[PDB]
Structure 1
Amino acid sequence: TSFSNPGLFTPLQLGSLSLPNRVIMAPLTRSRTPDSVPGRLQQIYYGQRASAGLIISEATNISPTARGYVYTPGIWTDAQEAGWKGVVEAVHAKGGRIALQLWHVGRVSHELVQPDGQQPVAPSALKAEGAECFVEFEDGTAGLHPTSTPRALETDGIPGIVEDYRQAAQRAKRAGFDMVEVHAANACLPNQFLATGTNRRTDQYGGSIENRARFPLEVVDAVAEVFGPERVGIRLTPFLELFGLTDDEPEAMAFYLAGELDRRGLAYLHFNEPDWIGGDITYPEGFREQMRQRFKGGLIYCGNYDAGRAQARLDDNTADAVAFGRPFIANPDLPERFRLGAALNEPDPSTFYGGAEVGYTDYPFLDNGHDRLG
């Protein structure tokens, strides 16, 4: 009697927050902020997509050291916090809910993008092979550049990183954000500690499942003290090998985190599927079922999802909601388009990063023949 038959437009209680639908906007880096301060353009971009059951913001740098991509928003400065407040306010004025995703690129960075040409930090001094990051060269030009070799974080340095996360959450709550999502996927800093291939530490923050998750859980606890676990989420990518990251214990870690995070009572777990409509490996048969039983809170999945496959996960009772990235980039009113089964706008990869409003806020809404912009 517990499990009903929810649909894409069935409201959902995600932690202590009420969502109008289950069509979530996945976190998407757009590099549309030359200065790390969100402005009116973001107010327009995010506002256009306020119909999302929940908007997960673009990854946002918790500090200068956490940056790996230029023109990305920050959240360690008053100017940035004020910039976000205008964005958060804009989303609310249109009926939406927004979560700020706390970002730290870890080893996926370069001295050029790093402040004062400082060396990128990470759990182990292992370079990310073939990995590239977005940097602005000395001649004012910007583009992809190979990631450099990071330095292993000193054991006594980890508490500082956690504090940076805590500080970001504190500015986020003060800015009016409904929730915060700890970015621990796509091979960023937190993910680097979790994966065996990237974590070779011999202190208490590496060596075993419990150690590799020690720092990530400290971050989670840190932000949950500010927002309360009911308003905190975390993104994960178990069997995902991205930016040269490899893992020998994907499942064992996913199961352990699920249990630790469920005990903490987190609002949700956001999974970015390793899948790809053109390659990649896939989740182990029975992985989704296990997560559902191990984590009682909200389960969000993302990756090459359409209306039909999304509903399937809802029916299988292996997901509570589904996030959409690219489709939400090209369709500000994606949820409505799914309700009417309307055709979707075609995403333009060329304008996913950098630039201004073109390929950002120029994707058209559906025309019902009644709405007027007079």
Structure 2
Amino acid sequence: MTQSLFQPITLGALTLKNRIVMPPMTRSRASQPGDVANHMMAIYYAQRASAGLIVSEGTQISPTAKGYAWTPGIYTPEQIAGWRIVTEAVHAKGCAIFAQLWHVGRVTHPDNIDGQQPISSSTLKAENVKVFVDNGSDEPGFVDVAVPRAMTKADIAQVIADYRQAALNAMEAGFDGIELHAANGYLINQFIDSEANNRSDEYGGSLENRLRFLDEVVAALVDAIGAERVGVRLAPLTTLNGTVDADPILTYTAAAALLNKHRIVYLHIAEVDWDDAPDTPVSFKRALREAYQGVLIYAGRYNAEKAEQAINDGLADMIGFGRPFIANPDLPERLRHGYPLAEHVPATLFGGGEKGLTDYPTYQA
């Protein structure tokens, strides 16, 4: 019935209104040129500010961290200012918002990163994966990803520096914190998962080595803005974007414990990615609950009943609703009352303008 779902919760120095999270969702509406967050995005997020916490769509930390056309960056002064319009709008509505810092690694195409070859833990191409690019028209052009080059020690230092600076930029933009996207097959995930990492140096070769990049990036983020303002997203079992780990229960319980040592403010588990909804054993969820003792968030095909159950069973503290939030700006109100949920239109998820972004109405009987 959602009683627990509508209980407030403390997140670091913040006190959130409820346990509902608007998870990070790329909409590719950033202004061109410059990939700048804008007015329509500010309206879009403000319309959904009844969530307890909003996590922004992935925002690239550098020119070569981008994987899809028209996603907003968080590395130029103008990009920071664009995000400020968004955070000001969201804060005016009374809501906390974290910026999801993104580096896609090999899940991109040269067209999206100034013609550069993508980087990854190794030279392994993500199999059966596509991204989209700008092709002289306002419709996403889907293309196969490219074969990446393996990161050097210098590349690793550079990316850590880019993440660190992006966190400071997020604070300058008025965000309440940042979420490290270490999930859904992107760069950090390309180091964590065994089948995506063939490195022979200290960043591959053992569980400790595979978690090293995550460890170092998180250490830098925490050093920059404080553990209370750092959340991290992981995807233990989904494999849609090409990353598979041989022993995910061990790898991810270890990762959860490692992140717990950093005292990150929340751990966010991406339980489903599109239609990739692998069985996620309750025993595993309970192990994660013991390994990481901060705020635990899950997202992936949840409805009101399942969300309430997960919280009451002690598996999660907050639950994210992605697709439902796209089509229902007043999703919390609808979940609480049991009002029917509008469904989103796939064709307007990416690119375009306000249509399919800010024109989904609030519920009206």
Structure 2 length-normalised TM: 0.96
> Cα offset for 1:15?
2.4
Partner of 1:77: 76
Work out which of the residue numbers 351, 354, 357 in structure 2 matches 1:354.
Answer: 351
CA–CA separation in structure 1 for the residues paired with 2:107 and 2:152: 18
The answer as to 2:278 corresponding to 1:305 is no
Partner of 2:127: 129
CA–CA separation in structure 2 for the residues paired with 1:141 and 1:208: 43
Partner of 1:55: 54
CA–CA separation in structure 1 for the residues paired with 2:136 and 2:359: 31
> Cα offset for 1:137?
2.7
CA–CA separation in structure 2 for the residues paired with 1:254 and 1:141: 37
The answer as to 2:9 corresponding to 1:9 is no
> Cα offset for 1:179?
1.1
Work out which of the residue numbers 201, 204, 208 in structure 1 matches 2:202.
Answer: 204
CA–CA separation in structure 1 for the residues paired with 2:273 and 2:71: 26
1:6–1:213: structure 2 CA closer, same or farther, 3 Å change rule?
farther
Work out which of the residue numbers 148, 152, 155 in structure 2 matches 1:154.
Answer: 152
The answer as to 2:93 corresponding to 1:94 is yes
Q: Following superposition of structure 1 onto structure 2, how do residues 33-48 of structure 1 map, counting pairs within 5 Å?
A: 33-35=30-32, 36-48=35-47
The answer as to 2:349 corresponding to 1:342 is no
* Partner-residue secondary structure (3-state), 1:356: coil
CA–CA separation in structure 1 for the residues paired with 2:251 and 2:295: 19
> Cα offset for 1:285?
4.3
1:255–1:345: structure 2 CA closer, same or farther, 3 Å change rule?
same
* Partner-residue secondary structure (3-state), 1:328: helix
The Cα RMSD (Å) is 1.6
Work out which of the residue numbers 117, 120, 137 in structure 2 matches 1:119.
Answer: 117
Partner of 2:266: 268
Q: In 1, are the aligned partners of 2:45 and 2:90 still within 8 Å (CA)?
A: yes
Count residues with an aligned counterpart.
Answer: 362
CA–CA separation in structure 1 for the residues paired with 2:104 and 2:246: 21
- Percent identity between matched residues is 49
Q: In 2, are the aligned partners of 1:99 and 1:178 still within 8 Å (CA)?
A: yes
- Please identify, of 96-105 and 283-292, the stretch whose mean Cα deviation from structure 2 is larger: 283-292
> Cα offset for 1:221?
1.2
CA–CA separation in structure 1 for the residues paired with 2:278 and 2:337: 33
1:255–1:79: structure 2 CA closer, same or farther, 3 Å change rule?
same
Q: In 2, are the aligned partners of 1:26 and 1:56 still within 8 Å (CA)?
A: yes
Q: In 1, are the aligned partners of 2:81 and 2:173 still within 8 Å (CA)?
A: yes
CA–CA separation in structure 1 for the residues paired with 2:163 and 2:262: 18
The answer as to 2:171 corresponding to 1:173 is yes
CA–CA separation in structure 2 for the residues paired with 1:197 and 1:318: 28
Structure 2 unaligned regions, length at least 5 = none
Structure 1 unaligned regions, length at least 5 = 369-374
1:308-336, Cα deviation, whole Å (9 max, x unpaired): 10000011011001001000000111111
The one-letter code of the counterpart of 1:147 is: V
> Cα offset for 1:281?
2.7
1:320–1:247: structure 2 CA closer, same or farther, 3 Å change rule?
same
Work out which of the residue numbers 22, 29, 36 in structure 1 matches 2:19.
Answer: 22
* Partner-residue secondary structure (3-state), 1:60: strand
CA–CA separation in structure 2 for the residues paired with 1:189 and 1:235: 12
1:78-114, Cα deviation, whole Å (9 max, x unpaired): 0000111111111001111100000011001111211
Work out which of the residue numbers 275, 288, 291 in structure 1 matches 2:285.
Answer: 288
* Partner-residue secondary structure (3-state), 1:89: helix
Q: In 1, are the aligned partners of 2:138 and 2:351 still within 8 Å (CA)?
A: no
* Partner-residue secondary structure (3-state), 1:171: helix
* Partner-residue secondary structure (3-state), 1:164: helix
The one-letter code of the counterpart of 2:222 is: A
* Partner-residue secondary structure (3-state), 2:64: helix
Work out which of the residue numbers 182, 185, 207 in structure 2 matches 1:184.
Answer: 182
> Cα offset for 1:126?
0.7
Work out which of the residue numbers 306, 312, 316 in structure 2 matches 1:315.
Answer: 312
1:140–1:14: structure 2 CA closer, same or farther, 3 Å change rule?
closer
> Cα offset for 1:255?
1.2
